């Protein structure tokens, strides 16, 4: 195809400069823009790449399992879990000094080790997996699955098995199989695990592969299921005294719907999760048999979209022609996919802390913070990518003549209204949230905290009171005993749910206040503003009044010159790039709120947050300055402690967060005219005229340098906050 390293692009291969290297790294996975590309070859490369990603996922999980099996104290952790530290992996750093080996020796280890703040200990212990040989077996099996995915990705690149373009565009059979099998049979099989293994493992006996065909998950065994007497699977719910991992207080039920938490572990019941995965398995197996594949029954998604045109034309032509703008467009598919994935990742984060599924994962506090922060930053990034790929769809894959007047072209018909009302909502939220925060800053400054504007969140307290939280006296559907909701569920799950939510110590529907109102509106500002930037870049991806031919310039291009006033950062890529800043800000707000509310809950002084979260010097003093003491003292002149690595990573994240400012503030032109002097000096320095570059050393490109600054910025954001949130939450542990 080409000659030099970007073999996929003969435009960068025919680039004498160093831009070749960078852009060939960056555009390597943009198969749509490569030379000699076809839709068939694009789809096949995507399929093989998905196989490679699955292989790397299984390899990374096998690595986790191996390093907990080899270097972990997991066999000791399953004895006294809430008073023994997890161990992620060992450490062999030949730069370590002897004090750092004395300090990083934790968890009763033969040497220095790292504390698993990821929760794999709790999750593996909850699903069975007691001894280290079980984790070894799991790592072997996931190595096997990695090799299997690599085999599949190589096999589906050969001509005898290269699938056709019309096979990846079978958008009915794929939904049918993925709902029925990938979502339903997989949830059914996880119920099979939770019933044959994890529930017996929680109740003592260790049902493993050698003895699972001759033990009964329920003492009757498939009589209740086939005879329909399913209540027999909810007979002995191991009520209120069960010790996880031992048969004391255990039971026989496997699918009892109890609601609420275990008393000991403060996690959900494995019977609850078994029944859950069973229920959604039935629902997904039912929902699978919907789309017509080969058998003369089912729906055609075309004639569902084509048929959903409202009379009166309030939408216009409706979804007439939208099957073709998604089936033939992989960027629409990717945008919708990442939208759903970001929504459910945020949901994972928001439910795993308040409804923790793993044993003794609510008791280790650093794990919950790391997990919530992880999944929320992942969700914000995935959401930013959903929108970026919607913009890339509007540029690369959108055909206006195919979808005239439909529900998607009507976006661009009135994109100014969407953008301007998002620009109203975000502007309102910021003006008023910041005005109230600054009012409270000044009131606390002037020594009159009684003059604060502490707007109670009545509308969330009312929802909490609609769930059984008897902390506000609203007497709503589940806080009121005389109601239809507290009658049709008072016999099934509301006992456990009420006794869990009313507990002030867990994370289930925390008692909120005016600081929670104010920070929720900061969160709304962040979501609305990131949405504004992204939607504005997506709808102005095809063009605007300042650059109506933007679609001809692609997604990522630097600018349109200084003319017409100035067109810096006009691309949809640039909108994405600014929205990553606003996204990281938004998730920093949501996670600062989470971590301070939770560290104040875990410490005990919820009053600290309730009186200090309403003014920003409370966030700077009582959260950032206060909780960062044990962090920045990770290495002092007279010694160090186990938080030395988190202090170093804190400062490292500061350093790269600041280095991104070099690429964001300082732009090109200064650097090309610097490297011209450097090239002069190298070509005129004796004993270095001998050495000459092969790639002409140009400065970084513009859009590239926005990316590089954003990468340094985000790496520093993430590393800084990870260090602070783990060090502060591990320096004291509640």
């Amino acid at each position: 195809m080409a000659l030099r390293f970007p073999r996929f692009s003969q435009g960068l291969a025919q680039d004498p400069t160093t831009r070749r290297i960078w852009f060939g790294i960056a555009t390597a996975h943009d198969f749509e823009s490569h030379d000699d590309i076809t839709e068939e070859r694009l789809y096949q490369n995507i399929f093989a790449s998905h196989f490679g990603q699955l292989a790397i996922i299984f390899l990374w999980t096998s690595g986790n399992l191996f390093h907990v099996a080899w270097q972990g104290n997991f066999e000791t952790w399953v004895q006294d879990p809430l008073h023994v530290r997890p161990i992620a992996h060992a450490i062999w750093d030949p730069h370590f000094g002897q004090p750092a080996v004395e300090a990083f020796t934790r968890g009763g280890a033969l040497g220095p080790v790292n504390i698993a703040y990821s929760g794999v200990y709790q999750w593996w212990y909850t699903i069975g997996l007691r001894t280290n040989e079980d984790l070894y077996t799991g790592a072997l099996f996931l190595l096997f699955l990695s090799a299997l995915s690599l085999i599949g990705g190589w096999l589906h690149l050969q001509p005898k098995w290269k699938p056709r373009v019309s096979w990846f565009k079978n958008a009915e059979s794929r939904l049918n199989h993925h709902l029925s099998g990938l979502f339903g049979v997989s949830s059914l099989a996880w119920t099979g695990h939770l019933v044959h293994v994890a529930i017996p493992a929680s109740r003592g006996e260790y049902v493993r592969w050698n003895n699972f065909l001759n033990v009964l998950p329920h003492p009757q065994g498939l009589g209740p299921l086939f005879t329909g007497q399913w209540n027999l699977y909810a007979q002995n719910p191991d009520s209120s005294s069960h010790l996880f991992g031992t048969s004391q207080g255990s039971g026989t039920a496997i699918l009892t719907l109890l609601g609420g938490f275990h008393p000991q572990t403060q996690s959900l019941w494995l019977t609850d999760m078994a029944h859950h995965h069973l229920a959604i398995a039935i629902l997904f197996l039912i929902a699978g048999h919907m789309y017509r594949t080969n058998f003369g029954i089912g729906h055609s998604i075309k004639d569902l979209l084509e048929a959903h045109i409202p009379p009166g034309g309030r939408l216009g032509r409706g979804h007439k022609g939208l099957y073709d703008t998604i089936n033939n467009s992989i960027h629409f598919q990717l945008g919708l996919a990442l939208a759903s994935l970001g929504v459910i990742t945020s949901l994972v984060a928001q439910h795993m802390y308040s409804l923790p599924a793993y044993a003794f994962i609510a008791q280790d506090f650093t794990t919950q913070a790391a997990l919530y922060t992880h999944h929320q930053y992942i969700a914000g990034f995935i959401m930013t990518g959903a929108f970026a790929h919607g913009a890339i769809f509007f540029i690369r894959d959108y055909n206006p003549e195919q979808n005239e007047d439909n529900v998607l072209a009507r976006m661009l018909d009135h994109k100014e209204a969407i953008i301007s009302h998002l620009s109203w909502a975000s502007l309102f939220l910021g003006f008023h949230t910041l005005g109230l925060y600054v009012h409270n800053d000044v009131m606390l400054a002037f020594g009159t905290p009684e003059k604060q504007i502490l707007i109670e969140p009545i509308f969330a307290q009312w929802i909490q009171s609609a769930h059984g939280k008897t902390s506000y006296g609203f007497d709503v559907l589940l806080s009121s005993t005389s109601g239809p909701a507290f009658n049709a569920g008072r016999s099934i799950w509301l006992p456990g749910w009420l006794n869990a939510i009313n507990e002030n110590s867990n994370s289930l529907f925390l008692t909120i206040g005016p600081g929670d109102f104010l920070v929720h509106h900061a969160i709304a500002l962040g979501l609305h503003t990131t949405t504004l930037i992204l939607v504005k870049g997506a709808l102005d991806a095809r063009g605007s009044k300042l650059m109506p031919d933007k679609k001809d310039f692609g997604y990522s291009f630097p600018c349109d010159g200084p003319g017409r006033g100035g067109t810096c950062d006009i691309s949809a890529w640039d909108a994405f790039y600014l929205a990553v800043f606003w996204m990281l800000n938004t998730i920093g707000w949501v996670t600062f709120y989470w971590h301070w509310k939770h560290i104040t809950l875990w410490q005990g002084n919820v009053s600290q947050f309730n009186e200090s979260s309403t003014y920003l010097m409370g966030w700077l003093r009582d959260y950032l300055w206060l909780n960062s003491s044990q962090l920045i003292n990770g290495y002092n002149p007279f010694g160090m402690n186990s938080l030395s690595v988190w202090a170093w990573m804190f400062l490292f994240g500061h350093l790269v967060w600041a280095t991104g400012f070099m690429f964001l503030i300082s732009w090109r032109g200064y650097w090309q005219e610097l490297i011209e002097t450097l090239a002069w000096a190298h070509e005129r320095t004796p004993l270095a005229n001998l050495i000459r570059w092969k790639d002409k050393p140009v400065a970084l490109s513009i859009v590239q340098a926005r990316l590089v600054g954003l990468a340094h910025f985000s790496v520093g954001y993430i590393f800084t906050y990870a260090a602070f949130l783990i060090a502060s939450t591990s320096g004291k542990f509640g």
């Binding site: 009131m443 002037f446 020594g447 009159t448 003059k451």
Partner: protein, 107 residues
């Protein structure tokens, strides 16, 4: 504490008037002007008041001088381009006699 600013008691900002000392509630300044005034031997608010009126007089004088030297009688380029005189005067007269008269004040 050196204090030469008092705030008005309107929206609770009166707490910025701190116990700086001396039966006075105000903002502790940091310009070191009190130290200059002790180096000048002021020792009275009447003297500060009259030199404030004098500095207002000089502000009006400089404003009138700018008006005069633009709008009424302005130099031309032969006046600025000569710099031997500008340096001679700014050395002997501005900085020379300025330091001389300050030494006279001090002495």
């Amino acid at each position: 504490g050196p204090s030469a600013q008092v705030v008005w008691p309107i929206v609770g900002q009166e707490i910025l008037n701190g116990d700086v000392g001396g039966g006075f509630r105000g903002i502790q300044i940091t310009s070191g002007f009190f130290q200059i005034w002790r180096a000048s031997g002021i020792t009275s608010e009447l003297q500060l008041y009259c030199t404030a009126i004098g500095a207002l007089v000089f502000a009006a004088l400089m404003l009138f001088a700018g008006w005069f030297h633009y709008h009424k009688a302005a130099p031309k380029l032969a006046w600025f381009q000569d710099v031997e005189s500008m340096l001679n005067h700014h050395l002997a007269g501005l900085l020379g006699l300025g330091s001389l008269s300050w030494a006279g004040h001090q002495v």
